[PDB]
Design a protein around this motif. Structure first.
Motif, PDB file in Angstrom:
ATOM      1  N   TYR A 266     111.402  66.389  -5.825  1.00 59.14           N
ATOM      2  CA  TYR A 266     110.099  65.382  -5.416  1.00 59.14           C
ATOM      3  C   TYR A 266     110.337  64.801  -4.215  1.00 59.14           C
ATOM      4  CZ  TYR A 266     107.235  61.339  -6.288  1.00 59.14           C
ATOM      5  OH  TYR A 266     106.277  60.407  -6.254  1.00 59.14           O
ATOM      6  N   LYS A 267     111.390  64.580  -3.575  1.00 59.29           N
ATOM      7  CA  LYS A 267     111.516  64.160  -2.297  1.00 59.29           C
ATOM      8  C   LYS A 267     111.013  65.080  -1.154  1.00 59.29           C
ATOM      9  CE  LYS A 267     115.372  62.316  -1.150  1.00 59.29           C
ATOM     10  NZ  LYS A 267     117.013  61.814  -1.050  1.00 59.29           N
ATOM     11  N   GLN A 268     111.449  66.315  -1.538  1.00 65.62           N
ATOM     12  CA  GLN A 268     111.059  67.372  -0.427  1.00 65.62           C
ATOM     13  C   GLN A 268     109.262  67.673  -0.637  1.00 65.62           C
ATOM     14  OE1 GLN A 268     112.001  69.636   1.897  1.00 65.62           O
ATOM     15  NE2 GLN A 268     109.638  70.516   1.706  1.00 65.62           N
ATOM     16  N   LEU A 269     108.775  67.473  -1.846  1.00 66.34           N
ATOM     17  CA  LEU A 269     107.423  67.695  -1.830  1.00 66.34           C
ATOM     18  C   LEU A 269     106.741  66.272  -1.314  1.00 66.34           C
ATOM     19  CD1 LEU A 269     105.757  68.615  -5.162  1.00 66.34           C
ATOM     20  CD2 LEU A 269     105.891  69.734  -3.208  1.00 66.34           C
ATOM     21  N   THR A 270     106.955  65.130  -1.374  1.00 70.60           N
ATOM     22  CA  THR A 270     106.607  63.989  -0.868  1.00 70.60           C
ATOM     23  C   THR A 270     106.595  63.817   0.522  1.00 70.60           C
ATOM     24  OG1 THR A 270     107.127  63.008  -2.984  1.00 70.60           O
ATOM     25  CG2 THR A 270     106.324  61.287  -1.176  1.00 70.60           C
ATOM     26  N   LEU A 271     107.503  64.336   1.123  1.00 72.78           N
ATOM     27  CA  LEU A 271     107.749  64.166   2.677  1.00 72.78           C
ATOM     28  C   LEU A 271     106.917  65.520   3.358  1.00 72.78           C
ATOM     29  CD1 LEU A 271     109.370  61.951   2.127  1.00 72.78           C
ATOM     30  CD2 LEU A 271     111.456  63.197   2.959  1.00 72.78           C
ATOM     31  N   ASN A 272     106.966  66.695   2.718  1.00 71.78           N
ATOM     32  CA  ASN A 272     106.163  67.591   3.465  1.00 71.78           C
ATOM     33  C   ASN A 272     105.085  68.110   2.443  1.00 71.78           C
ATOM     34  OD1 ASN A 272     108.963  67.780   3.776  1.00 71.78           O
ATOM     35  ND2 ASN A 272     109.098  69.497   4.896  1.00 71.78           N
ATOM     36  N   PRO A 273     104.050  67.121   2.035  1.00 71.47           N
ATOM     37  CA  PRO A 273     103.168  67.180   0.909  1.00 71.47           C
ATOM     38  C   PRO A 273     102.292  68.558   1.407  1.00 71.47           C
ATOM     39  CG  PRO A 273     102.400  65.801   2.847  1.00 71.47           C
ATOM     40  CD  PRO A 273     104.111  65.811   2.847  1.00 71.47           C
ATOM     41  N   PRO A 274     102.040  69.474   0.367  1.00 72.55           N
ATOM     42  CA  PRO A 274     101.337  70.824   0.525  1.00 72.55           C
ATOM     43  C   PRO A 274     100.001  70.434   0.343  1.00 72.55           C
ATOM     44  CG  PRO A 274     102.251  70.453  -1.727  1.00 72.55           C
ATOM     45  CD  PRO A 274     102.767  69.333  -1.056  1.00 72.55           C
TER      46      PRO A 274
ATOM     47  N   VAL B  99      99.182  68.047  -5.530  1.00 73.72           N
ATOM     48  CA  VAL B  99      99.642  66.618  -5.605  1.00 73.72           C
ATOM     49  C   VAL B  99     100.079  66.531  -6.797  1.00 73.72           C
ATOM     50  CG1 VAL B  99      97.130  66.249  -5.509  1.00 73.72           C
ATOM     51  CG2 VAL B  99      98.703  64.144  -6.102  1.00 73.72           C
ATOM     52  N   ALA B 100     101.632  66.699  -6.859  1.00 72.23           N
ATOM     53  CA  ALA B 100     102.470  66.661  -8.094  1.00 72.23           C
ATOM     54  C   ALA B 100     103.505  65.741  -8.263  1.00 72.23           C
ATOM     55  CB  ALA B 100     103.076  68.049  -8.106  1.00 72.23           C
ATOM     56  N   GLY B 101     103.965  65.421  -9.200  1.00 72.21           N
ATOM     57  CA  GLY B 101     105.069  64.378  -9.380  1.00 72.21           C
ATOM     58  C   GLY B 101     105.187  64.225 -10.828  1.00 72.21           C
ATOM     59  N   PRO B 102     106.015  63.175 -11.337  1.00 75.16           N
ATOM     60  CA  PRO B 102     106.354  62.615 -12.471  1.00 75.16           C
ATOM     61  C   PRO B 102     105.200  62.057 -13.200  1.00 75.16           C
ATOM     62  CG  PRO B 102     108.257  62.388 -11.333  1.00 75.16           C
ATOM     63  CD  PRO B 102     107.211  62.879 -10.256  1.00 75.16           C
TER      64      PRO B 102
ATOM     65  N   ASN C 230     105.058  59.861 -15.851  1.00 73.71           N
ATOM     66  CA  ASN C 230     105.494  58.677 -15.940  1.00 73.71           C
ATOM     67  C   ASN C 230     106.850  58.660 -15.428  1.00 73.71           C
ATOM     68  OD1 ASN C 230     106.451  56.119 -17.405  1.00 73.71           O
ATOM     69  ND2 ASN C 230     107.283  57.524 -19.089  1.00 73.71           N
ATOM     70  N   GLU C 231     107.120  57.280 -15.045  1.00 74.06           N
ATOM     71  CA  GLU C 231     108.736  57.031 -14.397  1.00 74.06           C
ATOM     72  C   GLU C 231     109.609  57.017 -15.311  1.00 74.06           C
ATOM     73  OE1 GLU C 231     107.309  54.417 -10.597  1.00 74.06           O
ATOM     74  OE2 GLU C 231     107.898  53.378 -12.265  1.00 74.06           O
ATOM     75  N   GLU C 232     109.350  56.550 -16.532  1.00 71.51           N
ATOM     76  CA  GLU C 232     110.356  56.752 -17.489  1.00 71.51           C
ATOM     77  C   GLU C 232     111.064  58.223 -17.781  1.00 71.51           C
ATOM     78  OE1 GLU C 232     110.503  52.437 -18.978  1.00 71.51           O
ATOM     79  OE2 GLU C 232     111.751  54.199 -19.614  1.00 71.51           O
ATOM     80  N   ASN C 233     110.095  59.201 -17.487  1.00 71.55           N
ATOM     81  CA  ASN C 233     110.647  60.608 -17.835  1.00 71.55           C
ATOM     82  C   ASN C 233     110.450  61.462 -16.593  1.00 71.55           C
ATOM     83  OD1 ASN C 233     111.568  62.985 -18.539  1.00 71.55           O
ATOM     84  ND2 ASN C 233     109.868  63.131 -20.178  1.00 71.55           N
ATOM     85  N   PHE C 234     111.497  61.620 -15.628  1.00 70.78           N
ATOM     86  CA  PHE C 234     111.315  62.925 -14.468  1.00 70.78           C
ATOM     87  C   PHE C 234     111.284  63.913 -14.722  1.00 70.78           C
ATOM     88  CE2 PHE C 234     111.769  62.814  -9.948  1.00 70.78           C
ATOM     89  CZ  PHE C 234     111.202  61.515  -9.573  1.00 70.78           C
ATOM     90  N   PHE C 235     111.456  64.355 -16.181  1.00 69.46           N
ATOM     91  CA  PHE C 235     111.258  65.939 -16.545  1.00 69.46           C
ATOM     92  C   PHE C 235     109.858  66.473 -16.600  1.00 69.46           C
ATOM     93  CE2 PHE C 235     115.537  64.776 -17.298  1.00 69.46           C
ATOM     94  CZ  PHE C 235     116.345  65.924 -16.541  1.00 69.46           C
ATOM     95  N   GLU C 236     109.005  65.659 -16.800  1.00 67.19           N
ATOM     96  CA  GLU C 236     107.609  65.935 -17.253  1.00 67.19           C
ATOM     97  C   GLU C 236     106.515  65.610 -15.986  1.00 67.19           C
ATOM     98  OE1 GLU C 236     106.889  67.848 -19.845  1.00 67.19           O
ATOM     99  OE2 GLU C 236     109.084  67.633 -20.457  1.00 67.19           O
ATOM    100  N   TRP C 237     106.141  66.464 -15.265  1.00 69.31           N
ATOM    101  CA  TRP C 237     105.339  66.331 -14.347  1.00 69.31           C
ATOM    102  C   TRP C 237     103.944  66.863 -14.429  1.00 69.31           C
ATOM    103  CZ3 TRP C 237     107.227  67.812  -8.738  1.00 69.31           C
ATOM    104  CH2 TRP C 237     108.750  67.375  -8.499  1.00 69.31           C
ATOM    105  N   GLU C 238     103.057  66.018 -13.526  1.00 65.47           N
ATOM    106  CA  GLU C 238     101.514  66.331 -13.394  1.00 65.47           C
ATOM    107  C   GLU C 238     101.271  67.014 -12.280  1.00 65.47           C
ATOM    108  OE1 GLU C 238      99.564  62.433 -13.984  1.00 65.47           O
ATOM    109  OE2 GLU C 238      98.910  63.369 -15.935  1.00 65.47           O
ATOM    110  N   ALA C 239     100.189  67.936 -12.248  1.00 67.53           N
ATOM    111  CA  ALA C 239      99.736  68.415 -11.073  1.00 67.53           C
ATOM    112  C   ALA C 239      98.512  68.900 -10.635  1.00 67.53           C
ATOM    113  CB  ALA C 239     100.605  69.893 -10.397  1.00 67.53           C
ATOM    114  N   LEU C 240      98.008  68.310  -9.663  1.00 63.92           N
ATOM    115  CA  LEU C 240      96.332  68.567  -9.304  1.00 63.92           C
ATOM    116  C   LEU C 240      96.165  69.606  -8.122  1.00 63.92           C
ATOM    117  CD1 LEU C 240      94.159  65.113  -8.962  1.00 63.92           C
ATOM    118  CD2 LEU C 240      94.238  67.133 -10.670  1.00 63.92           C
ATOM    119  N   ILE C 241      95.767  70.719  -8.787  1.00 61.36           N
ATOM    120  CA  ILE C 241      95.540  71.671  -7.603  1.00 61.36           C
ATOM    121  C   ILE C 241      94.262  72.018  -7.594  1.00 61.36           C
ATOM    122  CG2 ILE C 241      96.289  74.204  -7.304  1.00 61.36           C
ATOM    123  CD1 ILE C 241      98.413  73.924  -9.414  1.00 61.36           C
ATOM    124  N   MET C 242      93.727  71.686  -6.189  1.00 61.22           N
ATOM    125  CA  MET C 242      92.449  72.044  -5.695  1.00 61.22           C
ATOM    126  C   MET C 242      92.060  73.496  -5.464  1.00 61.22           C
ATOM    127  SD  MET C 242      91.854  68.713  -3.391  1.00 61.22           S
ATOM    128  CE  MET C 242      90.754  67.389  -4.229  1.00 61.22           C
ATOM    129  N   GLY C 243      91.075  74.024  -5.685  1.00 67.33           N
ATOM    130  CA  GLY C 243      90.866  75.494  -5.550  1.00 67.33           C
ATOM    131  C   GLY C 243      90.690  75.952  -4.004  1.00 67.33           C
TER     132      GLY C 243
END
Length: 167
Positions: free
Chosen positions: A15-23, A27-30, A32-45
């Motif tokens: 998550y750190k590596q992603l947030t500092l060198n954003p692709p 745009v991906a990340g957890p 909800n904060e209560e659970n870091f194991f479940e992520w969401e990702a918005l991939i633009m075509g």
């Protein structure tokens, strides 16, 4: 559980590596904060592909034994890609652990490994998006239509992006 705690450390490093060198376009990340194991990702075509302008939300579920096993990824929106099962499950090699379903000698730096990352996964999904690969027919029709009637494929791709934009 030590395994899970170690998995968590790892996820934070990702998550750190992603947030500092954003692709680009991702745009991906957890979710909800209560659970870091479940992520969401918005991939633009990809910019000059049949999926351009499309916004495809996806869910990445990470196993408590990460990074020893790959996460599960599936699109929340509707899709029509040779490498995406009809229910959203993304089927690329990197998301397959050694000793799974399809193969191909050429899939060395292609199978899951602790040396991978969500960065490389996403990076690969985007690539898969631009240039398909019916060598992994997770969706029969789409694999057929891509190598046979690409004509209509592009037509449907456009509908897919439009749907993703709520049109």
């Amino acid at each position: 559980s030590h395994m899970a705690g170690t998995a968590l450390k790892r996820l934070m490093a990702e998550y750190k590596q992603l947030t500092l060198n954003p692709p680009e376009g991702i745009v991906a990340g957890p979710m909800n904060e209560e659970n870091f194991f479940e992520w969401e990702a918005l991939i633009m075509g990809p910019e000059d592909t049949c999926f351009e302008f499309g916004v495809f939300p996806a869910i990445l579920s990470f196993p408590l034994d990460y990074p020893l096993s790959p996460p599960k990824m599936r699109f929340t929106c509707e899709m029509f890609h040779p490498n995406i099962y009809p229910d959203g499950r993304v089927c690329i090699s990197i998301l397959h652990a050694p000793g799974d379903d399809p193969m191909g000698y050429e899939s060395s730096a292609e199978r899951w490994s602790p040396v991978q990352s969500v960065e490389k996964i996403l990076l690969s999904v985007v690539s898969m998006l631009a240039e398909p690969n019916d060598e992994s027919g997770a969706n029969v029709d789409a694999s057929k239509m891509w190598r046979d009637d690409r004509e209509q494929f592009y037509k449907i791709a456009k509908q897919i992006v439009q749907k993703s934009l709520g049109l």
